[PDB]
Symmetry: C2
């Protein structure tokens, strides 16, 4: 029964399978409202932008999603709950390319972009609500599985080091295939911490931050790709939050670019990651040392409490 | 002929000693105006606060300083210039304890402090104007000396590493005398950079930042004072600015204190340092990793240009 931005993830008495209906009935109430808020979002978009064929397509997806959800009858038994899970799965799949479609749509509407903020905000709101929905949906679905150390999508004993390492491997491979090598990554600080945490956010953010740190490093060592500065990550775990600092020695972010780094370039990783972090009660801050490198600070608040 | 916040430091053709009069006549025009602005500052202070005997004393010092400066006749020859230097030296000495007097005065007026901002701002404005005056005064006086690599207070080839080391030594001694030991300090990055720079700001800021980093380290290793984590400093020198990052592993600044750290506690080092940095076109940012340590970023803009 953890919490987030009005979203609530349930953890309850299985056996009877009663917990699945209390969760499903909640998911059934919540999804329509969140889908509706996004539809309003598309309705308030500047006419010229909302007219773009692609944007107009994504808008129709939200409308059709709202219809299917509103058409489903109230969950009364485990029989309905099961079918409702099928609807939800169809939706997540139907909206798998929403973000790609938006980028394409907004890119084409770049010439008409008058207000710079009312686009950064539209993408923030769209990407986050989409994360909140995926977390709510995925959690309920996960309540049907029985993985060890997981109550839905909530890991009861997550290891920041473990998850960071997973993505380090992922990121290093993409890097080697692209440059012939990749920076090793050292991890210090609270390397042995373990606590209840929802990995999903970290599953998106970390690989975005790790690819950036590794790229900057390679792009600034074109003369010695076979010998580059390590990327150093530090884990700070306290009762209020989890802090992961990712430091690279890739030259830093030039003064002339310090602004456009956090904007979308249909570069989505950094702006999306900050949105995600802020949506969850955390933050994403950059410290640039021009000529040397960059320090990125990812802060995420702990699960409805304080643990280490 | 370098620049700053409307302040201008002169560098010119000696020999004739003509450069000393063009500088003196400028210093003579500038000091009264800056002293006057501060007097207005004391006049706009809330009556209850400005009534404190001590605060009232400091206020009288500014008034008497303004009088002496306004009484001095226009500099016409090297003879006047020389005497004017004597006036200036008397002033800097008469106002040597201004800050200590203010703290004492404001501390006593703590009960009456209604507005929290209009005090932080009064101390900012008082401490900075005081720095700007000391830089203007000291520079002109320094134009009489003939030190190597110095045009007044402007060092023509300052070494951040060199100046940092000087203060590391200073800070380590105070630390050992207080704890029996002190963290070693490693310095990386652009350790060989050299460029025109005014050391004064760094002469105050660095020892304040270095004492904090060393203190936090000792206070969080009371069980092993003989073996503590190094303090690590990184120098980033580019064409726009000089960045000195000071990282300690002293536990960081607790969430509950993150606000009061940048306030005055009549703790003056951090708030004064940020004021100084901002006054000079730079900044002072803190990144706290609760449970691990703190990273402090000092940024100072280069002398009327771009060098490395
Ligand atoms: Cl269009
Ligand atoms: Cl999704
Ligand atoms: Cl890559
Ligand atoms: Cl530790
Ligand atoms: Cl009083
Ligand atoms: Cl002074
Ligand atoms: Cl000390
Ligand atoms: Cl280097």
């Amino acid at each position: 029964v953890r919490l987030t931005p009005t979203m609530m993830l349930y953890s309850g008495r299985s056996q009877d399978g009663s917990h699945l209906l209390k969760s499903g009935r909640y998911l059934q109430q919540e999804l329509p409202v969140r889908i509706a808020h996004r539809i309003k979002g598309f309705r308030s978009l500047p006419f010229i932008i909302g007219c773009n064929p692609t944007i107009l397509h994504v808008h129709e997806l939200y409308i059709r999603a709202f219809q299917k959800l509103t058409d489903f009858p109230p969950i009364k038994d485990q029989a309905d709950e099961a079918q409702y899970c099928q609807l939800v799965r169809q939706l997540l799949d139907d909206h798998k390319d929403v973000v790609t479609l938006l980028a394409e749509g907004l890119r084409e509407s770049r010439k008409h972009i008058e207000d710079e903020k009312l686009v950064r905000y539209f993408l923030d709101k769209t990407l986050t609500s989409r994360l909140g929905i995926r977390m709510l949906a995925t959690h309920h679905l996960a309540l049907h599985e029985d993985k060890p150390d997981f109550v839905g999508i909530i890991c009861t004993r997550l290891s920041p080091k473990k998850i960071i390492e997973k993505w380090v491997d992922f990121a290093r491979r993409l890097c080697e295939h692209k440059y012939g090598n990749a920076p090793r990554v050292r991890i210090n600080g609270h390397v042995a911490a373990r606590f209840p945490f929802i990995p999903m956010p970290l599953d998106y953010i970390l690989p975005e931050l790790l690819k950036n740190a590794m790229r900057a490093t390679m792009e600034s060592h074109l003369d010695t790709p076979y010998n580059v500065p390590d990327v150093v990550i530090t884990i700070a775990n306290n009762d209020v939050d989890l802090i992961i600092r990712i430091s690279d020695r890739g030259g830093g972010i030039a003064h002339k670019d310090l602004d456009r780094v956090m904007d979308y370039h249909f570069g989505f990783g950094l702006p999306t990651s900050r949105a995600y972090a802020e949506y969850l009660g955390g933050s994403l801050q950059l410290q640039s040392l021009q000529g040397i490198g960059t320090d990125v600070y990812l802060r995420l608040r702990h699960i409805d409490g304080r643990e280490e």
